[PDB]
Amino acid sequence: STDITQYEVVEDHNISQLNHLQHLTPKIYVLNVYIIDVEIVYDQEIRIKVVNELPLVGKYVPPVDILEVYITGKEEVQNFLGDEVLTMDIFTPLLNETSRLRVFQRPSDRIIRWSPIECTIQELRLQRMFRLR
Amino acid sequence: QYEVVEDHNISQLNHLQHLTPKIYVLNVYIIDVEIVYDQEIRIKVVNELPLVGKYVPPVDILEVYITGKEEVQNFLGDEVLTMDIFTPLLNETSRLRVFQRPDRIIRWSPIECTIQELRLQRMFRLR
């Protein structure tokens, strides 16, 4: 429910830099990032926190280094799941490993939220298989 | 946790890589509140409300956490946890004093913050 067909695809990935972008850009950013937290709100929303690197020993990750990626609305959630039931368990294999996501700024409600494109649980599972082989 | 400082840049706070021993005094707008199971209150604040054509980027938002039964109960006093207690606070300025709590993600939390005190701040404001 947003036209992103015009958008140019870029490989910029500094998450700290992405979190500072004040204006809606017409770009899709390809990220290879670690999923470190997933939160589910009923069957209405999935929030995925990602970072470029897992923190080193005795280190912490500040909020600016975390991109919060939202899959929002019944339709987007169902597209993400396909023929799969929404439970926390489906996210377990993805935690603290890298996945490739393609994200864009979705405007709401004046807060910018980052959202993924053509992201599905089946596709993330496939990425894991490639990684593990 | 010990030095009290005046801070006017949530963006800067969001970048602090390490735990500090500082309490940061903020005069900010509450723009969103989320409640999780009588277990946690998450408060989103910004230094300035967005002007008519504009947007707020994530780095300009500080997410403040009141976490656990103890902290939540302290925040409430003799009050019932519902979203409507936050209605008069939304899109208005409140003074908060915040610090960084330890998982591997740094989280900001407020100090000696209660719904009663926030309500009193509003009464003063509305003078």
Side-chain angles (χ1 to χ4, degrees), chain A residues 1-63 65-133, chain B residues 1-58 60-127:
Chain A
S1 292
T2 285
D3 189 28
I4 59 154
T5 57
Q6 293 177 335
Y7 290 30
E8 45 174 349
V9 180
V10 301
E11 310 255 54
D12 297 82
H13 55 274
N14 186 321
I15 275 174
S16 169
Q17 300 188 349
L18 295 181
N19 278 323
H20 277 265
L21 288 171
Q22 182 120 23
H23 62 305
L24 293 188
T25 70
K27 287 173 175 66
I28 292 161
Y29 302 82
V30 181
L31 304 178
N32 290 283
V33 288
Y34 292 90
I35 294 174
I36 55 171
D37 202 10
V38 178
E39 176 158 17
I40 298 166
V41 179
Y42 311 83
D43 49 27
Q44 309 186 31
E45 189 162 89
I46 304 172
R47 306 168 186 170
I48 303 173
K49 293 190 182 73
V50 304
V51 304
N52 292 120
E53 297 288 331
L54 297 171
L56 320 81
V57 306
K59 252 68 175 174
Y60 297 95
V61 58
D65 279 348
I66 295 164
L67 199 75
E68 188 161 13
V69 176
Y70 292 78
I71 298 174
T72 309
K74 73 160 64 206
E75 209 74 358
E76 287 178 26
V77 175
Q78 289 305 302
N79 295 338
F80 172 85
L81 301 163
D83 284 318
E84 191 78 26
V85 56
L86 180 57
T87 58
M88 193 63 63
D89 304 330
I90 71 176
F91 300 99
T92 297
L94 312 176
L95 298 173
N96 305 318
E97 304 291 349
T98 61
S99 291
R100 179 170 171 283
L101 299 171
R102 290 187 292 123
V103 303
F104 72 106
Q105 294 154 305
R106 183 181 300 272
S108 49
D109 353 273
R110 305 308 297 182
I111 301 191
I112 285 167
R113 291 175 181 79
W114 289 87
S115 200
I117 299 159
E118 288 169 13
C119 183
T120 70
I121 185 69
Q122 294 81 5
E123 205 278 332
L124 290 172
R125 279 171 180 163
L126 190 54
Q127 288 188 37
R128 171 170 174 275
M129 294 305 297
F130 178 79
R131 176 168 55 75
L132 297 185
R133 302 301 309 279
Chain B
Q1 293 177 335
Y2 263 106
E3 179 179 14
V4 175
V5 288
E6 297 271 3
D7 194 276
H8 293 265
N9 200 336
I10 283 171
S11 176
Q12 294 176 149
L13 295 187
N14 278 327
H15 278 275
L16 292 177
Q17 299 260 2
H18 57 297
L19 294 180
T20 66
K22 289 204 170 97
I23 297 164
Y24 302 82
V25 177
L26 301 177
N27 283 276
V28 290
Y29 293 83
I30 300 180
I31 63 172
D32 190 43
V33 179
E34 175 162 35
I35 291 175
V36 187
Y37 293 112
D38 112 276
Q39 290 195 168
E40 185 168 87
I41 297 166
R42 309 173 186 171
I43 303 175
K44 290 182 173 186
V45 304
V46 298
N47 287 118
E48 296 284 1
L49 291 180
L51 297 184
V52 293
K54 318 294 185 184
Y55 289 99
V56 191
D60 284 347
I61 296 161
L62 193 73
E63 180 154 21
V64 180
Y65 292 77
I66 297 169
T67 299
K69 227 64 64 176
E70 201 103 4
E71 293 177 22
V72 171
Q73 183 166 336
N74 285 335
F75 175 81
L76 298 166
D78 298 6
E79 185 79 25
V80 179
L81 184 63
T82 60
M83 197 61 45
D84 57 72
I85 68 179
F86 300 98
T87 293
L89 308 181
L90 293 161
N91 309 307
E92 306 285 350
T93 63
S94 291
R95 183 177 180 270
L96 306 171
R97 300 193 286 132
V98 300
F99 73 109
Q100 298 158 296
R101 292 300 292 260
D103 286 345
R104 235 57 217 150
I105 294 158
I106 290 170
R107 284 179 178 77
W108 289 88
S109 273
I111 295 171
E112 303 174 24
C113 186
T114 65
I115 185 64
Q116 291 79 12
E117 205 276 337
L118 290 170
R119 282 173 173 156
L120 192 59
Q121 288 193 34
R122 175 166 171 279
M123 296 309 298
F124 177 77
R125 181 164 57 73
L126 291 184
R127 61 186 290 104

